[PDB]
Amino acid sequence: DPKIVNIGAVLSTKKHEQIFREAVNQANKRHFTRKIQLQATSVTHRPNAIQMALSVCEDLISSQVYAILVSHPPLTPTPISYTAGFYRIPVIGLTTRMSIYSDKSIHLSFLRTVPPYSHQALVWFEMMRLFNWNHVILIVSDDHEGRAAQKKLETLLEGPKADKVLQFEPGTKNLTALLLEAKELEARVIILSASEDDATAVYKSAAMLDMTGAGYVWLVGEREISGSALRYAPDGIIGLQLINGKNESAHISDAVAVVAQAIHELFEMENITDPPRGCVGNTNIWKTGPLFKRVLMSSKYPDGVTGRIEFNEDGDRKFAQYSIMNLQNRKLVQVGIFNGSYIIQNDRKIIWPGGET
Amino acid sequence: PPSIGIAVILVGTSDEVAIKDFHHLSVVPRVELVAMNETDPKSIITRICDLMSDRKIQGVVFADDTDQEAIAQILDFISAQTLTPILGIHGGSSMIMADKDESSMFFQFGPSIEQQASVMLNIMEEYDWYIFSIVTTYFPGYQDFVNKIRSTIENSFVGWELEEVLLLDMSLDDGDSKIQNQLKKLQSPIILLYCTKEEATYIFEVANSVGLTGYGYTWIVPSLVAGDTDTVPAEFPTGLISVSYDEWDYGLPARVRDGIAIITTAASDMLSEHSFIPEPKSSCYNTHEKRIYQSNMLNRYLINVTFEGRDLSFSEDGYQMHPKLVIILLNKERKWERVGKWKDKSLQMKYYVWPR
Ligand SMILES: *[C@@H]1O[C@H](CO)[C@@H](O[C@@H]2O[C@H](CO)[C@@H](O[C@@H]3O[C@H](CO[C@H]4O[C@H](CO)[C@@H](O)[C@H](O)[C@@H]4O)[C@@H](O)[C@H](O[C@H]4O[C@H](CO)[C@@H](O)[C@H](O)[C@@H]4O)[C@@H]3O)[C@H](O)[C@H]2NC(C)=O)[C@H](O)[C@H]1NC(C)=O
Ligand SMILES: Cc1nccn1Cc1cc(-c2ccc(F)c(C(F)F)c2)cnn1
Ligand SMILES: *[C@@H]1O[C@H](CO)[C@@H](O)[C@H](O)[C@H]1NC(C)=O
Ligand SMILES: *[C@@H]1O[C@H](CO)[C@@H](O)[C@H](O)[C@H]1NC(C)=O
Ligand SMILES: *[C@@H]1O[C@H](CO)[C@@H](O)[C@H](O)[C@H]1NC(C)=O
Ligand code: NA
Ligand code: NA
Ligand code: NA
Ligand code: NA
Structure with missing residues (x-):
């Protein structure tokens, strides 16, 4: 009779709950479980944040979960992060790309199998080295996300330099003042960080100032080549798509593999306490929480479905893979991949705004 | 005059009699002193949410005997989620809560x-x-x-x-x-x-x-x-x-009095100017549907209350102006x-x- 160790999950649908249940069962099959055996405990997202915080207590912490997997719903992971973080129960974000979850100060025990949108700067930097774009203009939204991208790119640059950074107020529709500043400059490589709706406004303004044609290069992320942002996007644009970024099934599979390995590595150590049983009356942190966080932050799973799993100083996914997308005759064409560390160009030729620079 | 419900939540051993010791404003307070034994997220969420379903709660005055700064965080969350003023007047509820939510109506005596x-x-x-x-x-x-x-x-x-x-x-x-x-x-x-x-x-x-x-x-x-x-x-x-913070001269019955005065004055002032006050939330479990019908409009009033010639005003970060x-x-x-x-x-x- 082994010691049952519960793993929690806040997933999108009942299908995904059955995938988690199966991933935990296969973990138990593949590992030596005479001493410690995993048990899946899960719920789907609740209609609001208070209901979700309550559910974390009632349905998950009541079962003494050692960690909680969280998918972005079909509403955010924040109430789960906050409630579990109170006890220092590690949370694993499976599909959340918002940079704010990298802030240790407010997301107390949080790791994710997907990187934040700001880590797209790693691809841009490699792209700049490859295409010899030594002078760039960076346009970011003046929000946490926009600033996170700027911070990330500036760190890599400090060879290739950012001639100027221009920030705009989110929701601004008339961006012709900002883009006129950018037009005056010598540099013709524009890197943008903005949400779908804000990228749309930049595209509309840039097209009006005849800045989406020959001589110009647009380097963008995922959010800026999605939804409405794609409708008004200039042809020739280069954007990214995180491979499996949205596959919740693949991320459940890999997060369970990482967690299972971490649990077994943890029980190799002494004086391992159980998490609190339920929230009511329990106001102290789980004493093994910090050790379990360190064990997770330093876990390596090389044969993951989504690739090589490792986490950085903020517990964000390292070695993430991206599709290098190019808008050719209003179609998104894959022109290459960023494999985790290197750019691999495929046999499809890049068409730059116009022809070939 | 119309009646506003104010819940005074007390965690730990306190003299309710001494606490139970005048407002000639547009609105009047209906104060209910409530005891609470636990300070975990479930307990605090459940207590406030249960109180809101029962009475028509216009605002909450919270006091605790603990050293738990996470109480401020749980209260900020509740306040922003339900668009209900909560005042953290003592204990961990008054402990610094940096970067309160954009939608927060959480204010602290500290x-x-x-x-x-x-x-x-x-x-x-x-x-x-x-x-x-x-x-x-x-x-x-x-x-x-x-x-x-x-x-x-x-x-x-x-x-x-x-x-x-x-x-x-x-x-x-x-x-x-x-x-x-x-x-x-x-x-x-x-x-x-x-x-x-x-x-x-x-x-x-x-x-x-x-x-x-x-x-x-x-x-x-x-x-x-x-x-x-x-x-x-x-x-x-x-x-x-x-x-x-002066635990000596600024005692718990004084802080509760001041808490009630802030919520009542803020309500009176909003009603005097707009011919309405916010409808107290019947539930915590409909916040998603009901949010286009709600706002933190009372904050412009709660931030600037003066009582018995004392400047009870708050900073843009929801802390006492002149402690x-x-x-x-x-x-x-x-x-x-x-x-x-x-x-x-x-x-x-x-x-x-x-x-x-
Ligand atoms: C993303 O894409 C990159 C780029 O290709 C991959 O990285 C390379 O991976 C290959 C295969 O694992 C590595 O190849 C090995 O290189 C050794 C020598 O490397 C030195 O020289 C190269 C080239 O100049 C440098 O890039 C590198 O830094 C080193 O200084 C060889 O000794 C190896 O040969 C031995 O093993 C192979 C099998 O692996 C046998 O076939 C041979 O017979 C022999 O025993 C081998 O060829 C290469 O070093 C890696 N390059 C870099 C830059 O790290 C990533 O793996 C890929 N990532 C993902 C997730 O797919
Ligand atoms: C400290 C701080 N400054 C700015 C943000 N934060 C983090 C924070 C935590 C929680 C919180 C913490 C614990 C908990 F259990 C719950 C549950 F009630 F939702 C919420 C709520 N609001 N903000
Ligand atoms: C999602 O991942 C699973 C493997 O984890 C795979 O079976 C499925 O094909 C993937 N979906 C897509 C759209 O590629
Ligand atoms: C708190 O403890 C006292 C102890 O006598 C008890 O009477 C009271 O009912 C408890 N409160 C709750 C909410 O159960
Ligand atoms: C604060 O309240 C007074 C009434 O006492 C009012 O006249 C004043 O305009 C308010 N101050 C601010 C800054 O809104
Ligand atoms: Na086994
Ligand atoms: Na983290
Ligand atoms: Na190519
Ligand atoms: Na609203």
Whole structure:
């Protein structure tokens, strides 16, 4: 009779709950479980944040979960992060790309199998080295996300330099003042960080100032080549798509593999306490929480479905893979991949705004 | 006059009779003193949510006997989610909650991170303690603490010398002795520590091992580290200086009176100007549907209440505008002692020569 160790999950649908249940069962099959055996405990997202915080207590912490997997719903992971973080129960974000979850100060025990949108700067930097774009203009939204991208790119640059950074107020529709500043400059490589709706406004303004044609290069992320942002996007644009970024099934599979390995590595150590049983009356942190966080932050799973799993100083996914997308005759064409560390160009030729620079 | 329901939530042993000891405004308060035994997220959410379903709750006045800063966080969340004013008037509910939600209606009876950092520098200028170091954790507000010190020091023609600024990760186990290694870098006679009370107990234990808590080392800490002055952790060093909110003259019945006055005045003023007040939320479980019919409009009123000729106003970060702060020193008997007052941006110390 082994010691049952519960793993929690806040997933999108009942299908995904059955995938988690199966991933935990296969973990138990593949590992030596005479001493410690995993048990899946899960719920789907609740209609609001208070209901979700309550559910974390009632349905998950009541079962003494050692960690909680969280998918972005079909509403955010924040109430789960906050409630579990109170006890220092590690949370694993499976599909959340918002940079704010990298802030240790407010997301107390949080790791994710997907990187934040700001880590797209790693691809841009490699792209700049490859295409010899030594002078760039960076346009970011003046929000946490926009600033996170700027911070990330500036760190890599400090060879290739950012001639100027221009920030705009989110929701601004008339961006012709900002883009006129950018037009005056010598540099013709524009890197943008903005949400779908804000990228749309930049595209509309840039097209009006005849800045989406020959001589110009647009380097963008995922959010800026999605939804409405794609409708008004200039042809020739280069954007990214995180491979499996949205596959919740693949991320459940890999997060369970990482967690299972971490649990077994943890029980190799002494004086391992159980998490609190339920929230009511329990106001102290789980004493093994910090050790379990360190064990997770330093876990390596090389044969993951989504690739090589490792986490950085903020517990964000390292070695993430991206599709290098190019808008050719209003179609998104894959022109290459960023494999985790290197750019691999495929046999499809890049068409730059116009022809070939 | 119309009646507004105000819930006064009291956690821990309190004199309800003394608390139960006038408003000639557009609206009148219907006060209900409520007891609560537990301070975990479930308990606090459940209590407030149950109260809102039963009575028509216009605002909440919260007081606790704990040293749990996470209470402010749970309250901010509830307040922003339900668009209900909550006032953290005592305990962990009044402990600094940096970066409150955009939609928050959570206000605290306590000094801000910036005011305390300012008070700390005033103590140093008094005794000509110009050479110092800063130690913070990732406790929210650390960036605000360091920046206030830094900006002040920069725009001053005083011989200030900030030797080291340490940032300690408390979220991981210290099996590698990283904190110890970091703390060993400290050489300054004065150390400004910004963290929680539970974090300070660890920090101090390690600081002692490295011989940094004795004579020659003076630690100055904020309000939340001292917390409840009757709970002195064994690891706290003798000679520890802290800023404290006046628990002496500003007692719990006064704070409850002031809490009720703020919610009632703010409501009266909004009704007087707009011919309406916000409809108290019937449930916590319909916040998603109902949010286009709700806002934090009352904040413009709650931030600026004056009562019995006393400026009860709040900062844009939801902290008391003009508090009377007390300067405390942990003596040889391991009891906190009053050694100064912080009044009208003026510091008044007990000693000219700081004693041992
Ligand atoms: C993303 O894409 C990159 C780029 O290709 C991959 O990285 C390379 O991976 C290959 C295969 O694992 C590595 O190849 C090995 O190189 C060794 C020598 O490397 C030195 O020289 C190269 C080239 O100049 C440098 O890039 C590198 O830094 C080193 O200084 C050889 O000794 C190896 O040969 C031995 O093993 C192979 C099998 O692996 C056998 O076939 C041979 O007979 C022999 O025993 C081998 O060829 C290469 O070093 C990696 N390059 C870099 C830059 O790291 C990533 O793996 C890929 N990532 C993902 C997730 O797919
Ligand atoms: C400290 C700080 N400053 C800015 C943000 N934060 C983090 C924070 C935590 C929670 C919180 C914490 C614990 C918990 F249990 C719950 C549950 F009630 F939702 C919420 C709520 N709001 N903000
Ligand atoms: C999602 O991942 C699973 C494997 O984890 C795979 O079976 C499925 O094909 C993937 N979906 C897509 C759209 O590629
Ligand atoms: C709190 O403790 C007292 C102890 O006598 C009890 O009477 C009271 O009902 C408890 N409160 C709750 C909410 O159960
Ligand atoms: C605060 O309240 C007074 C009434 O006492 C009012 O006249 C004044 O305009 C308010 N102040 C601000 C800054 O809104
Ligand atoms: Na097995
Ligand atoms: Na993290
Ligand atoms: Na290509
Ligand atoms: Na609204």
